Ligand binder design. Structure first.
Ligand SMILES: [Mg+2]
Ligand SMILES: [Mg+2]
Ligand SMILES: [Mg+2]
Ligand SMILES: [Mg+2]
Ligand SMILES: [Mg+2]
Ligand SMILES: [Mg+2]
Ligand SMILES: [Mg+2]
Ligand SMILES: [Mg+2]
Ligand SMILES: [Mg+2]
Ligand SMILES: [Mg+2]
Ligand SMILES: [Mg+2]
Ligand SMILES: [Mg+2]
Ligand SMILES: [Mg+2]
Ligand SMILES: [Mg+2]
Ligand SMILES: [Mg+2]
Ligand SMILES: [Mg+2]
Ligand SMILES: [Mg+2]
Ligand SMILES: [Mg+2]
Ligand SMILES: [Zn+2]
Ligand SMILES: [Zn+2]
Lengths: 114, 69, 91, 135
RNA sequence: CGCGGCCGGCGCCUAGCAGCCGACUUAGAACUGGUGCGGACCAGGGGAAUCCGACUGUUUAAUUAAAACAAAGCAUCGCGA
RNA sequence: UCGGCCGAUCGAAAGGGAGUCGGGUUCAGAUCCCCGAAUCCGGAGUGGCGGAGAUGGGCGCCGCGAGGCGUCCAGUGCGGUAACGCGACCGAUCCCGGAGAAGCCGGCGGGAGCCCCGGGGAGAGUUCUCUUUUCUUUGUGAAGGGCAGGGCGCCCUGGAAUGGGUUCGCCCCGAGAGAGGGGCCCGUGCCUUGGAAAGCGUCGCGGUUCCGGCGGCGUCCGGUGAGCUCUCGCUGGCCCUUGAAAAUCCGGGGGAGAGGGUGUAAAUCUCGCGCCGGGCCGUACCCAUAUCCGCAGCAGGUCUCCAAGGUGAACAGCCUCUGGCAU
């Protein structure tokens, strides 16, 4: 069968020297040098292990030529934090501030007695 | 390359300033109109022949109408 | 069927290293690789990540523990002692 | 008893308007065979009015006091109820449930909420409602 | 009436059938050759003991691969900056 | 006024690192030349064209209605319960986060290339007899669009013991199973633009001492798998071992500011198209029983990639095809 040769001068099976087989219109098999597999962002919460949705997974320098919509989600912290931990932060922010009102009122009615 | 879907988009594509030439390729099943713009080669596929002939005479003047047969 | 009479988990060591050394490492290797019930989420998924580091797969909570067990008997008495001294310190 | 009532301030938990403060216009809490879950018609504010100080000037203050609002129908599970309430008299005939089938009406209802919110933002009442939640 | 389609009075595969397609693998049997058949190739001689080193590992490139070194285990010593 | 890379600089032709592929062509060079299709980065001050922002309501009037005038008020986009989506989608200093950016081994699954099988062609081989036979060959690059396929620790309804779902193994569930309906990511597979005009296989006709010549026909339909090799993914195991850093790029938080008075409008634009540029050095060949080191055309030494048929457990040994050679 037809055996293949590298098309560049890097002769080692390093991480940057990864190829795939392609059949040309001239009916021959050649190496096509692939790009590395990109990763979606991880959530800024740093807790849940899944990667974000709605964001195209590319190499970091490819993000410079992508449009804005392809890199984020239409939500607060969208494209940086997951939906689940935004809901928890909204609840955590509101409930702690409500608690601050309680303790402020609680000591305010505690100081009515000398 | 870009594939132009309907007939009207091809007309103002061929009337662009950067349109160098239009090539007409007559296959067994369709007629392809390929206009060579600056960035893309826009191909319009016409299934029948009367519409292809009609489009041939409606092309803008002063543009190369090279026939591939 | 029960496959070994007494070696259990240290059957991977074969005839090597001595019976008492294999018996000694047997109870450590069992606790090292055991899955503990997480005290935060309630699931039995708290397993050792590295030496002294215990991680839960469900709530993704990481705890600093003992080398081979989730907590050491030394640290448990210490936590009880610190609690006792704290409640003695304040009044 | 039930607390999800018209006039009650809720916090939006999910969607484009996550973290926005909002007021319940009409609670359904039974389903309508098109939204079998418990939902509520909600008028909220998309853009909060900016902070205004004494050393700003009349024209700058009026520019910063503008409010961009929104109207939505939210599932209860995506709403965080609060203890606060505002007695803002939103026109029910303008802000109603069938406003979502015609964009022209949705603009009309969203305009109605905007003018009612802004005049209530003036006179310095319901100050917590018009402050952006920091999270 | 959209020799075909929307609902239904219109019936009991319910011990599961009908047709089509498909890899290799195992077991059993008969017959058979001048008892030869893992037919070339591939491909452990075995047992009973004694000494030393626990083992795996390493070593004098160019005469010594060992019982030598290493090793885990055991023990001792110094040290609070 | 703000401003700690808290330290110059060097250090990898196997680490990180945007973006080029197909066909043709030489005596010797081609991913570099030619042809054809793209693409990245940078620039545009006098703003290149569109599109977005962004062009709607209220009240007085005129007007048969429709529609026109004046005034006032908005207008830094919109949709979905949600996951999230749509072509853009104002915004600085500052802050937070992500990607870059991660070991070894196991077991599965998806995809491709190769191998195998059954037919249809074209050309060859055998024909002493047989053989509808044996052999060769029977394409579609990048980059776009669409659709499969794979994955999801993503969402909504709902609330499960007579526990159930489920893997080769596991494992999962009132912290929300099963079921129903959705969303996202990858998409190297298929179709399509590229594209048949090229390439190839055959059969011919002309010659330009040496034609990218001219022409006819064809480039088809299926089936298989613990197969082999790459690749993608899922899930485990091991560690007193936990398996780089930095350039570089991006998202978010915040809102200092900027933009116009209702105009065929402004600030602004990560949207479509258009315009210009990409300098320097390397590039032949050998890469070894003869181009390197060993005094030499020296049985030694010298880092890698590709990898067919039979037998067989097998990258074993033995025989063979492509390719190579002359002991
Ligand atoms: Mg490199
Ligand atoms: Mg392809
Ligand atoms: Mg020894
Ligand atoms: Mg010993
Ligand atoms: Mg040696
Ligand atoms: Mg020697
Ligand atoms: Mg001893
Ligand atoms: Mg340097
Ligand atoms: Mg060459
Ligand atoms: Mg094709
Ligand atoms: Mg479920
Ligand atoms: Mg052809
Ligand atoms: Mg070369
Ligand atoms: Mg030699
Ligand atoms: Mg020399
Ligand atoms: Mg020689
Ligand atoms: Mg000889
Ligand atoms: Mg000779
Ligand atoms: Zn999270
Ligand atoms: Zn836990």
């Amino acid at each position: 069968v037809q055996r293949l040769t590298y098309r560049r001068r890097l002769s080692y099976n390093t991480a940057s020297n990864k190829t795939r087989l392609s059949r040309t219109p001239g009916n021959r098999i050649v190496y096509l040098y692939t790009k590395k597999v990109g990763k979606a962002p991880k959530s800024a919460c740093g807790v849940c292990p899944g990667r974000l949705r709605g964001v195209r997974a590319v190499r970091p320098k490819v993000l410079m030529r992508l449009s804005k919509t392809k890199k984020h989600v239409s939500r607060a912290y969208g494209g940086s934090m997951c939906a689940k931990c935004v809901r928890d932060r909204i609840k955590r922010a509101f409930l702690i501030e409500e608690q601050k009102i309680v303790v402020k009122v609680l000591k305010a009615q505690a100081q009515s007695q000398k | 390359p870009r594939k132009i879907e309907e007939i009207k988009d091809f007309l103002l594509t061929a009337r662009r300033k950067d349109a160098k030439s239009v090539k007409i390729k007559k296959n067994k099943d369709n007629v392809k109109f390929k206009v060579r713009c600056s960035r893309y080669l826009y191909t319009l596929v016409i299934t029948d022949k009367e519409k292809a002939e009609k489009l041939k005479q409606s092309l803008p003047p002063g543009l190369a109408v090279k026939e591939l047969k | 069927a029960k496959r070994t009479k007494k070696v259990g988990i240290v059957g991977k060591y074969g005839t090597r290293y001595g019976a008492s050394l294999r018996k000694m490492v047997k109870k450590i290797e069992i606790s090292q690789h055991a899955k503990y019930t997480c005290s935060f989420c309630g699931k039995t998924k708290m397993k050792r990540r590295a030496v002294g580091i215990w991680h839960c797969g469900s709530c993704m909570k990481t705890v600093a523990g003992g080398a081979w067990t989730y907590n050491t008997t030394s640290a448990v008495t210490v936590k009880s002692a610190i609690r006792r001294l704290k409640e003695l310190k304040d009044q | 008893g039930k607390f999800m009532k018209p006039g009650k301030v809720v916090l939006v938990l999910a969607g484009r308007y996550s973290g926005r403060k909002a007021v319940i216009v009409k609670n359904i809490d039974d389903g309508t065979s098109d939204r079998p879950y418990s939902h509520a018609l909600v008028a909220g504010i998309d853009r909060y009015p900016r902070k205004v100080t004494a050393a700003m000037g009349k024209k700058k203050i009026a520019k910063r006091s503008k409010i961009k609002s929104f109207v939505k129908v939210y599932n209860y599970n995506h709403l965080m109820p609060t203890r606060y309430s505002v007695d803002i008299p939103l026109d029910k005939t303008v802000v109603n449930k069938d406003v979502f089938r015609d964009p022209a009406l949705k603009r009309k209802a969203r305009r109605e909420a905007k003018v009612k919110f802004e005049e209530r933002y003036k006179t310095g009442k319901n100050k917590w409602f018009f402050q952006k939640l920091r999270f």
